[PDB]
Design a protein around this ligand. Sequence first.
Ligand SMILES: *[C@@H]1O[C@H](CO)[C@@H](O[C@@H]2O[C@H](CO)[C@H](O)[C@H](O)[C@H]2O)[C@H](O)[C@H]1NC(C)=O
Length: 129
Amino acid sequence: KVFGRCELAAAMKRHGLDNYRGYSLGNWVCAAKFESNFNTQATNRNTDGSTDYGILQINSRWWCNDGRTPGSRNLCNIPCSALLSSDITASVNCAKKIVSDGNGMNAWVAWRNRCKGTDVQAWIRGCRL
Ligand SMILES: *[C@@H]1O[C@H](CO)[C@@H](O[C@@H]2O[C@H](CO)[C@H](O)[C@H](O)[C@H]2O)[C@H](O)[C@H]1NC(C)=O
């Protein structure tokens, strides 16, 4: 499913991401925009053989099991395919663990490179949240 900008903002807010660990909602919407372009089915292979999954492009090397990343970790205790669901719940719960992992949103390279330090509020502008 490809979410609408405000549609995703609403879904994320409902799942308690607005200000989770001090990161305002716009940060999360911005990260999703550049990581997957709001598409829950996004997958991208990484250099070391692992793969990123979902709207938030979560890595199989550490967070989920895809059965093909020899010696990876599954810290979110879920199969990576669960991160591709039109229901973002699993992606949100796993992201909550990632952002609390000590490096905040820097875990998301698209966020560091294109969101961090910008007017992230523009991303939820116009939405009825
Ligand atoms: C993207 O890849 C990053 C590098 O592998 C990864 O960051 C690592 O996460 C580890 C989690 O146990 C640990 O904190 C390392 O110090 C850190 O470099 C990051 O989590 C990945 N991002 C996502 C969204 O999967």
